[PDB]
């Protein structure tokens, strides 16, 4: 396919979801349909005060709108 998730294995990723939610966690595994297993998952809802810890989770590949590393640079 198009994004090799293997390169992101065991690092923190950032994942946007269709209804506004953002989820950050360590990528543990994934499948061809881009369902993901994330650990130490934090879920932000639609700012920072809005954080819930969920721990180990499964995100549906179907509602995923973007994925990137959690590492990034401001301005």
């Amino acid at each position: 396919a198009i994004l090799d998730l293997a390169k992101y294995k065991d690092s923190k990723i950032r994942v946007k979801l269709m209804g506004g939610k953002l989820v950050i966690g360590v990528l543990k595994g994934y499948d061809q349909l881009m369902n993901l297993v994330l650990d130490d998952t934090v879920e932000y809802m639609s700012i920072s005060k809005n954080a819930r810890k969920l721990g180990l989770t499964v995100i549906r590949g179907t509602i995923l709108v973007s994925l990137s590393s959690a590492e990034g640079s401001d301005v």
Partner: protein, 84 residues
């Protein structure tokens, strides 16, 4: 599959993608698939709101840089392609 075909010719080129929520992703197209999912490199992410506000410079340039990003085709609104 018209969009998929044109983009696969635009690999290596820079573009400005706006998402359904108004987020703008500018980057280098590195890959496209049959459903119009995209991976870009060298990416800079900002809103239409910020890009319009920085026109007569105020609160300059509030953006975010990423090494790589995966974008879901069905979440794309439009794509500004390079002038050439």
């Amino acid at each position: 599959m018209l969009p998929l075909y044109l983009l696969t010719n635009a690999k290596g080129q820079q573009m400005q993608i706006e998402l359904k929520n108004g987020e703008i992703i500018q980057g280098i197209l590195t890959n496209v698939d049959n459903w119009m999912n995209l991976t870009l490199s060298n990416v800079t992410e900002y809103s239409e709101e910020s890009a319009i506000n920085s026109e007569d410079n105020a609160e300059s340039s509030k953006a975010v840089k990423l090494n790589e990003i995966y974008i879901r085709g069905t979440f794309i609104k439009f794509i500004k392609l390079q002038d050439n």
